[PDB]
């Protein structure tokens, strides 16, 4: 309040492989080290139920 100063948290990884293994995906996406896969959770749920109604390899075609 009143400006002039800010506080936050910072991590510095010793190497890029450590970061890609320990860092949460959203922060990597923020830093450009990963891509945001655009999905709808609800659509996944509906497709999962519809496919659970089916048996075999024909599940993928439903």
């Amino acid at each position: 309040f009143g400006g002039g100063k800010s506080s936050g948290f910072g991590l510095i990884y010793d190497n890029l492989e450590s970061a890609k293994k320990f860092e949460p995906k959203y922060r990597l996406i923020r830093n450009g080290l990963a891509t945001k896969v655009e999905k709808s959770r609800k659509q996944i749920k509906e497709r999962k139920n519809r496919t659970k109604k089916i048996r075999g390899v024909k599940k993928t075609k439903a």
């Binding site: 309040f1 009143g2 400006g3 002039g4």
Partner: protein
């Protein structure tokens, strides 16, 4: 369950039992005008805080001077009253805590102390100055006029560095006027 349901909250004031008593209305208005209060609730909450402090002090006075709770909690209460400027140095007893009035608490507001420090021409000018973000306590600007100022923070009440009265740039009114000129 919602975790937010566990956050505590409480009321800061009570309304008077008798709403239309001349003497009480006059006394409240006198205090409000003397300290530039926005309504009676600002004085009622100060009375509420004084009531809780007084009740605590009275309850330790009704205990032995060797009761380890009275030694501990009375020391804490005296520390809190000396910290906020409500008690002098000679007044180093729980008895003097019972003698405190709402005037003592109202005198420690940032509005009152800004007015008495010479930074403002009136108590109301002090109120607007604080609400306009021109006042900082230490390095922290305070826009809350009911701010209770400690004695260690009294000498650090100063104009904000971002304010036109504290070395900052001119406000939008002045700048617009010079741009017109």
């Amino acid at each position: 369950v919602h975790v937010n349901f566990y956050r505590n909250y409480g009321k800061t004031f009570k309304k008077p039992r008798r709403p239309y008593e001349k003497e009480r209305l006059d006394a409240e208005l006198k205090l409000v005008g003397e300290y530039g209060l926005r309504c009676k609730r600002e004085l009622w909450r100060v009375q509420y805080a004084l009531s809780r402090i007084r009740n605590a002090a009275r309850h330790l006075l009704t205990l032995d001077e060797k009761n380890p709770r009275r030694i501990f909690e009375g020391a804490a209460l005296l520390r809190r009253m000396n910290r906020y400027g409500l008690l002098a140095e000679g007044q180093d007893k729980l008895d003097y805590v019972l003698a405190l009035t709402a005037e003592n608490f109202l005198a420690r507001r940032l509005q009152t102390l800004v007015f008495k420090a010479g930074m403002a021409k009136s108590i109301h000018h002090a109120r607007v100055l604080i609400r306009q973000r021109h006042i900082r306590v230490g390095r922290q600007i305070v826009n809350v006029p009911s701010f209770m100022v400690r004695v260690e923070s009294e000498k650090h009440i100063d104009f904000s560095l971002t304010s036109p009265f504290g070395g900052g740039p001119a406000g939008r009114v002045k700048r617009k006027n010079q741009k017109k000129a």
